[PDB]
Design a protein around this nucleic acid. Sequence first.
DNA 1: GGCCAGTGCCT
DNA 2: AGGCACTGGC
Lengths: 105, 658
Amino acid sequence: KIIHLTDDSFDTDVLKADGAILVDFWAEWCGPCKMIAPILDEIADEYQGKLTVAKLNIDQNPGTAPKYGIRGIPTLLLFKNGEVAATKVGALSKGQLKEFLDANL
Amino acid sequence: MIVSDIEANALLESVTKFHCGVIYDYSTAEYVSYRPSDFGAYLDALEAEVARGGLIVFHNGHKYDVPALTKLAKLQLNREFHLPRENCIDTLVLSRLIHSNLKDTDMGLLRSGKLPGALEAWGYRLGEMKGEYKDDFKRMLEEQGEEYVDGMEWWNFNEEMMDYNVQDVVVTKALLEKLLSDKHYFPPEIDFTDVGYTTFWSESLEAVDIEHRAAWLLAKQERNGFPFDTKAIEELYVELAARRSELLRKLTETFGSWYQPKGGTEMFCHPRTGKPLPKYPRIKTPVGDTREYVAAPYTPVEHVVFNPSSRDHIQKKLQEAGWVPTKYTDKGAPVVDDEVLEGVRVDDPEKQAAIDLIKEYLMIQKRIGQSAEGDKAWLRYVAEDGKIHGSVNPNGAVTGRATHAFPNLAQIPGVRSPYGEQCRAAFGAEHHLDGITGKPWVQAGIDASGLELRCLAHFMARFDNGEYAHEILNGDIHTKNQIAAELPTRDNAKTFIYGFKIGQIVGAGKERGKELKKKFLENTPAIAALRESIQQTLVEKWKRRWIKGLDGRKVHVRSPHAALNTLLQSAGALICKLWIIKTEEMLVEKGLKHGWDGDFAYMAWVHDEIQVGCRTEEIAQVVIETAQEAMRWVGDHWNFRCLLDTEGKMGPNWAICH
DNA sequence: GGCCAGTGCCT
DNA sequence: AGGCACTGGC
Ligand SMILES: Nc1ncnc2c1ncn2[C@H]1CC[C@@H](COP(=O)(O)OP(=O)(O)OP(=O)(O)O)O1
Ligand SMILES: [Mg+2]
């Protein structure tokens, strides 16, 4: 269902996805990150075809994140071809997210 | 006798204006105040006691009021003023030989909020007493619009100052008495506030003399300085700052950065419940559109680069490598000293390789800090005259040992230590070009041979009747030890003894260690004899919570098990204190003048050794020999049962003289 | 800054 | 054992 990126996988997986990938930097120690967790999971199914959801832990992949000035988590980026389309840090509701997305998707 | 004190415009090293001087002559019972104009008179007054062959009492005057007057005398009046040691008393010196067990703030150069134990009465009442004058002045002017300036409370003389002056002396005379009152160091039958210097000195416990002469000499050494090679060290600082820069890079590569939670205010609360789960990293719930957040918690984190200096990072990264921390600290953390680091064994090859680079990176730092970047770094402490005047406390130990500081020149890495060849080479006579001839001086390093093992010999002769004494000299000592304790190698015995972690030192870790002490303190009943005789004179649950030192002084003792070392460290301590005193003295009773402008100069004294500076190789060799007699003297003088000795060495710097 | 913790340098 | 003091972390 949901994509599980890696430092080495990130490029050819999100960057050249051509489609829209909402990358989610996270860590098993952040409460909020564990919160938005299931949200994004269902977001993935209720958006199959139009949106691709890819999670990337920053404890396991410390190289990637430090490039988007990540200063918080779950920092969310909606990738739309090479560059960041939109950024949002926090646990947006199962409805708040569907609003932050659509208004961009 | 008289009890004076003076207020100048600055510390010795920068003082240039006498502000006032109070005095309380004991034969008059008066307090004659001298003002800035009276300076010359002040000098006359003191110079008067010396004529009577009287005694002048100062509080820390040995290291200041006294040499600061010699300075100011030439300066302000083009006068040659020189109070002779013999007529000077120093309540600080004394208060350090009587209150040996407490602790001082060093006259207000350290915060007592971090200093343990109990603070004295006048001590805290003469040291902090300086700040009482600051605020008293600051206030009286911090209200009159005039903004307090850095330290303008001392730029110019005034009445407030003239007052705090006069009070200084009273507290001083007050102290002076509470000290002379001590029947252990001063016999009640005499009243020293009424004797001449020659009577004060002889008619009192020997420590009082040995301490003052020392306090006076080392104060001379301090003022001398230690020619320090700024260049050679600035040179090293670049070589290290560099080797650092690499090891860092080479590492930061092997150990990437990472994120850590930092900055969360509130506490993550269960989605349903609402419990303030602590274990979980604090978050920040704020607002919310190019909005950054929503009202939707989030843990604020920081990006942190591996830091070889951080013993934490070293534990982190190395643990994720598969290291299983054995030794931890009574604070819930793993011991990461070089010891364990040496032992750590992970699987990733590149990584275990980097353990040896941290070990070295940590050390490179112990050097860059001690020499260049630290607060008491050499490079920060070098004087304009190209010498480092580290301070020396001729006591402050408890056994008699001095304490060095600012910077501490008794912890320069030795030559048997990474870069301990370049550091030592930067402290040397050879770095001082003569005043006239303009030619480099020569250094003379003299040190006491086996002073330790010997203090034991002597003390355990009242049992061995010359055994170890003779062994240590007319034969061999260590093999007897090596045989004493059932041990394998001699060098092992050299450690076993000079260190009494024992069992370990031989192989095992407990039983064999706590078995050797048995066979050793069994085939050598003399050390066993000593040990017993002491417990007998202290234990009964105390009788005398102290011990008597070679000169007479009381030498407090922390614990029954420390009893013997105490007794031993002290003996060798005083032995040297007295030694460097005689040495210089003798060098004078021969014809040489102490000082840079003279023939020789004391540069350093690290327990059982001294680094004298000589103007000519000739003089240099005499000192080396003068140092000999002196020691031998100290021997007969204290009826030592084991001939003591010294070994000389001549050279350009501390590095080649050891 | 002021302050402990964990360490390492000398004899 | 007796001291001083550097760096990291709060
Ligand atoms: N662990 C130690 N702690 C303190 N001082 C020590 C320690 N080990 C040795 N020493 C002292 C003893 C005298 C000094 C130099 O030792 P060194 O081994 O050169 O002389 P030594 O008298 O033991 O033997 P020798 O002169 O025959 O070689 O260092
Ligand atoms: Mg004073």
